[PDB]
Design an enzyme around this catalytic site. Structure first.
Site, PDB file in Angstrom:
ATOM      1  N   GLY A  23       0.844  -1.186   0.000  1.00 17.86           N
ATOM      2  CA  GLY A  23       0.000   0.000   0.000  1.00 17.86           C
ATOM      3  C   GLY A  23       0.869   1.221   0.000  1.00 17.86           C
ATOM      4  N   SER A  24       0.438   2.227  -0.748  1.00 18.74           N
ATOM      5  CA  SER A  24       1.221   3.441  -0.935  1.00 18.74           C
ATOM      6  C   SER A  24       0.267   4.618  -0.852  1.00 18.74           C
ATOM      7  CB  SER A  24       1.919   3.392  -2.304  1.00 18.74           C
ATOM      8  OG  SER A  24       2.936   4.385  -2.409  1.00 18.74           O
ATOM      9  N   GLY A  25       0.797   5.838  -0.999  1.00 15.81           N
ATOM     10  CA  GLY A  25      -0.051   7.045  -1.146  1.00 15.81           C
ATOM     11  C   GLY A  25      -0.528   7.590   0.193  1.00 15.81           C
ATOM     12  N   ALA A  26      -0.990   8.849   0.209  1.00 13.83           N
ATOM     13  CA  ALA A  26      -1.200   9.591   1.466  1.00 13.83           C
ATOM     14  C   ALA A  26       0.090   9.432   2.294  1.00 13.83           C
ATOM     15  CB  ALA A  26      -2.456   9.070   2.242  1.00 13.83           C
ATOM     16  N   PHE A  27      -0.015   9.513   3.632  1.00  7.19           N
ATOM     17  CA  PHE A  27       1.114   9.215   4.545  1.00  7.19           C
ATOM     18  C   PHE A  27       1.590   7.759   4.365  1.00  7.19           C
ATOM     19  N   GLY A  28       0.621   6.881   4.087  1.00  8.82           N
ATOM     20  CA  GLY A  28       0.831   5.443   3.939  1.00  8.82           C
ATOM     21  C   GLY A  28       1.973   4.938   3.069  1.00  8.82           C
ATOM     22  N   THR A  29       2.467   3.792   3.511  1.00  6.78           N
ATOM     23  CA  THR A  29       3.346   2.904   2.758  1.00  6.78           C
ATOM     24  C   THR A  29       3.362   1.726   3.721  1.00  6.78           C
ATOM     25  OG1 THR A  29       5.715   2.384   2.431  1.00  6.78           O
ATOM     26  CG2 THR A  29       5.236   4.567   3.396  1.00  6.78           C
ATOM     27  N   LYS A  49       4.052  -0.651   8.883  1.00  7.93           N
ATOM     28  CA  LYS A  49       3.497   0.658   8.478  1.00  7.93           C
ATOM     29  C   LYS A  49       4.446   1.820   8.734  1.00  7.93           C
ATOM     30  CE  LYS A  49      -0.290   2.879   9.965  1.00  7.93           C
ATOM     31  NZ  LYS A  49      -1.651   3.181   9.369  1.00  7.93           N
ATOM     32  N   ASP A 141     -12.985   6.241  13.733  1.00  5.11           N
ATOM     33  CA  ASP A 141     -12.753   6.063  12.292  1.00  5.11           C
ATOM     34  C   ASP A 141     -13.130   4.674  11.746  1.00  5.11           C
ATOM     35  OD1 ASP A 141     -12.122   6.697   9.641  1.00  5.11           O
ATOM     36  OD2 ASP A 141      -9.953   6.529   9.919  1.00  5.11           O
ATOM     37  N   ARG A 145     -13.065   0.244   5.153  1.00  3.69           N
ATOM     38  CA  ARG A 145     -11.642   0.386   4.781  1.00  3.69           C
ATOM     39  C   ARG A 145     -10.732   0.030   5.949  1.00  3.69           C
ATOM     40  NH1 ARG A 145     -11.963   5.966   6.767  1.00  3.69           N
ATOM     41  NH2 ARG A 145     -13.931   6.202   5.621  1.00  3.69           N
ATOM     42  N   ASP A 159      -6.535   0.384  12.371  1.00  3.91           N
ATOM     43  CA  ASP A 159      -6.353   1.826  12.101  1.00  3.91           C
ATOM     44  C   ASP A 159      -6.800   2.752  13.241  1.00  3.91           C
ATOM     45  OD1 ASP A 159      -5.989   4.095   9.717  1.00  3.91           O
ATOM     46  OD2 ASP A 159      -5.281   2.059   9.093  1.00  3.91           O
TER      47      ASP A 159
END
Ligand SMILES: COc1cc2ncnc(Nc3ccc(F)c(Cl)c3)c2cc1OCCCN1CCOCC1
Ligand SMILES: [Cl-]
Length: 302
Positions: A23-29, A49, A141, A145, A159
């Site tokens: 997973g990539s993108g936003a703050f994420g990886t 993460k 949250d 997802r 999350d």
């Protein structure tokens, strides 16, 4: 409040092996990986993460709060922190959830998901959430997802980016009205989002208020508008969704009630969800050395 003796475990970067990206993108990886604790002769499938490459101090305060929360939870329907790795940037490590996010999973498998599964998921999530309530966390949250699939029969809430203790101190479409108008957040506002989560599932991954922009949402929600009743949903199931969305937060179901109701319903799943081609629905890992693979659930420390 009682002392939080959760044990934060710090882990040597050298304890990891194969590490593909997920997973990539936003703050994420987020990465898939393998963790070999010390000399212990176990291999543990793990997700890792990072909050991006750029180790800018703002990010670490947010990720460490997450770790604090994830390290404090212990229950089958909630994801636990295996520990952290203090590399150049901060890494959270947790049990790999092989089938991914539940949202993608319902989208990916509309045609082969039956009523037993949907209802069992609702049961499991209501449990994860009731667990959090006992430990007094407001998740803030909850959404498809943020639910991960260990196996098609085993889901866990993840999350904790926004988790807080009750009375402490932005996904609009999942938020209770009081939250949108007053930033009031309660276990009961989590129930609202639970309502929405269920709706994502009964619609096999629809987007809530598709088309409507987030700025209009509280306007709509004041007019008395709610998500429509999904095709597969009996009124029994939909009426439960609807109660999650009462203006009076105290008039909403409790997670404990949700467990009981969904539980009853899951004893006779065809009476509550109408799915074409239902009964005949069956749902279901990359190395030669798998002798010593242990799930994290079976990996405990005293
Ligand atoms: C096989 O897929 C996953 C297993 C996972 N197992 C455990 N945890 C995951 N995510 C996650 C979430 C929060 C965390 F703090 C940590 Cl440490 C990990 C996982 C995320 C995983 O995929 C991340 C979601 C992948 N999709 C990619 C497409 O858009 C939605 C997300
Ligand atoms: Cl949103």
């Amino acid at each position: 409040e009682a002392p939080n003796q959760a044990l934060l475990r710090i882990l040597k970067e050298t304890e990891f092996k194969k590490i593909k990206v997920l997973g990539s993108g936003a703050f994420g990886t987020v990465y898939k990986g393998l963790w070999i604790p010390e000399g212990e002769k176990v291999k543990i499938p793990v997700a890792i993460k990072e909050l991006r490459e750029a180790t800018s101090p703002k990010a670490n305060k947010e990720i460490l709060d997450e770790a604090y929360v994830m390290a404090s939870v212990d229950n089958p329907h909630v994801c636990r922190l295996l520990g952290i790795c203090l590399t150049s940037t901060v890494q959270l490590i947790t049990q790999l959830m092989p089938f991914g996010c539940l949202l993608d999973y319902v989208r990916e498998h509309k045609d082969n998901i039956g009523s037993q599964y949907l209802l069992n998921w609702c049961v499991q999530i209501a449990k994860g959430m009731n667990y959090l309530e006992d430990r007094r966390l407001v998740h803030r949250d909850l959404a498809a997802r943020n639910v991960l699939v260990k196996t098609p029969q085993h889901v866990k809430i993840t999350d904790f980016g926004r988790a807080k203790l009750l009375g402490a101190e932005v996904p609009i479409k999942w938020m209770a009205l009081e939250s949108i108008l007053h930033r009031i957040y309660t276990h009961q506002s989590d129930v609202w989002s639970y309502g929405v989560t269920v709706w994502e599932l009964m619609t096999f991954g629809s987007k809530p208020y598709d088309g409507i922009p987030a700025s209009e949402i509280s306007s709509i929600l004041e007019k008395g508008e709610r998500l429509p009743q999904p095709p597969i949903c009996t009124i029994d199931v939909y009426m439960i969704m609807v109660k999650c969305w009462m203006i009076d937060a105290d008039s909403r179901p409790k997670f404990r009630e949700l467990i009981i109701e969904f539980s009853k319903m899951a004893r006779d799943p065809q009476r509550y969800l109408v799915i074409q081609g239902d009964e005949r629905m069956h749902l279901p890992m990359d190395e030669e050395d798998m002798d010593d693979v242990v799930d994290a659930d079976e990996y405990l420390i005293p």
